[PDB]
Amino acid sequence: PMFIVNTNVPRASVPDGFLSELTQQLAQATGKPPQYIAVHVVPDQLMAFGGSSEPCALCSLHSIGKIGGAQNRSYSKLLCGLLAERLRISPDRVYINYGDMNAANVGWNNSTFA
Amino acid sequence: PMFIVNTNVPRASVPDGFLSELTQQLAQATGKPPQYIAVHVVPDQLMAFGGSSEPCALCSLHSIGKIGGAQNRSYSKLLCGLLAERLRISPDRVYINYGDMNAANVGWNNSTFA
Amino acid sequence: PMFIVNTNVPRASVPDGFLSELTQQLAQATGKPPQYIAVHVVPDQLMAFGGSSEPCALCSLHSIGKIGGAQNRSYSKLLCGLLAERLRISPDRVYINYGDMNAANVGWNNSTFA
Q1: How far is the CA of B56 from the CAs of A84, B42, B44, C114, in angstroms?
Q2: Is the CA virtual torsion B96, B102, B105, B111 positive or negative?
Q3: Which of A1, B66, B108, C24 has the most crowded Cβ, counting Cβ within 10 A?
Q4: In terms of C-beta density within 10 A (0-12 exposed, 13-18 middle, 19 or more buried), how is residue C1 classed?
Q5: Based on the number of CB atoms within 10 Å of its own CB, is B28 exposed (0-12), middle (13-18) or buried (19 or more)?
Q6: Binding site annotation covers A77?
Q7: Which residues of A touch B41 (CB under 8 A)?
């Protein structure tokens, strides 16, 4: 799984250990081993949500499976919870795009996961 | 809607008011309320288009619906027009990926839009 | 085609000529003319892969066609090879999301490719 957070919150506001917390929580939520979880946080971005430059986040979670209606609601409560607690972003100023990847469409280690 | 522009144009060349202009014009073009429009501009990027480092942009527009052949032509004329007028990027050095998101695959406000 | 690499490798570790090498090798691999290849390298990123912050990359390749099981394996060997040789990133710390775009869903030059 690959989780990307783009935010206007400044770099100094991202706590030490946030990448590790995201890695652990996403391993638990997806049921995938932490060795396969990649996380990427991009602070200090020029962005707006609803026309406002108040704190916001634009995110994606790509996974080979483990994507669906109920799972995505659970992921959204988890990840909005983390962004609210750790980055002080309101959940109604977060979008998360969920992408269910075919294994043949993910490259890794000189080949694909197919 | 979520609109992301990555460009090699420098930050100082992005005019004041640009995220607001994008927000307003995307609300009009997509028919979505402005409160649901998210915009993100990333200047100063290391990129090339056709092997050239002249000004260019790589963009995405994701929306729950309002994506299709005719709509996307209209969005492209709008957004290339804005990038030409405001960032001085030639329209033939812009790519925009349009993505039609299922409501169940967009997280927001601790849940999804399903 | 549009190729994006996000990496924690520092900007000074990206060798001169790398965007041109990516452009040339993706033209050859996809069979598309280099005038249509766009490339984007984002160094100095805050990321982790499998819980650690040794060099890693999170990438995407979007193309109108030329995406499939065998092609994607070939692209992965080529691109993991380039990232290992030029950025010293281990191939098992690279993810590449391959996206097959419909022509009507790619904006360019005030219209779409439809």
Answers
A1: 35, 12, 11, 21
A2: positive
A3: A1
A4: buried
A5: exposed
A6: no
A7: 46-47
* Residue in C4, C107, C111 closest to B98 by CB: C107
What is the architecture of the domain spanning C1-114? 2-Layer Sandwich (3.30)
For A19, which DSSP code?
Answer: H
Determine, for residues C76 and A110 on separate chains, whether the beta-carbon distance falls below 8 Å. yes
C-alpha span between C102 and C114 (Å, rounded): 8
Distance CA C70, CA C12 (A): 34
Residue type, B107: G
DSSP output for A29-56: HH---GGG-EEEEE-S-EEEETTB-SS-
Chain A residues near residue B4 by CB distance under 8 angstroms: 6, 58
Residue from A105, A106, A113 whose CB has the most chain C CBs within 10 Å, to mutate: A105
Way the structure was solved: X-ray
Mutation target vs C (from B26, B44, B45, B76; most C CBs, 10 A cutoff): B76
Query: Which one-letter DSSP state was computed for residue A109?
Result: T
Which three-class secondary structure state does DSSP give residue A110? coil
What is the secondary structure of B44-90 as a DSSP string? S-EEEETTB-SS-EEEEEEESS--SHHHHHHHHHHHHHHHHHHH---
What's the token pair of residue A33? 């081993």
- Taking the C-alpha atoms of residue B84 and residue B18, their distance in angstroms, rounded to an integer, is 12
Cα distance between residue B100 and residue B67, in whole Å = 6
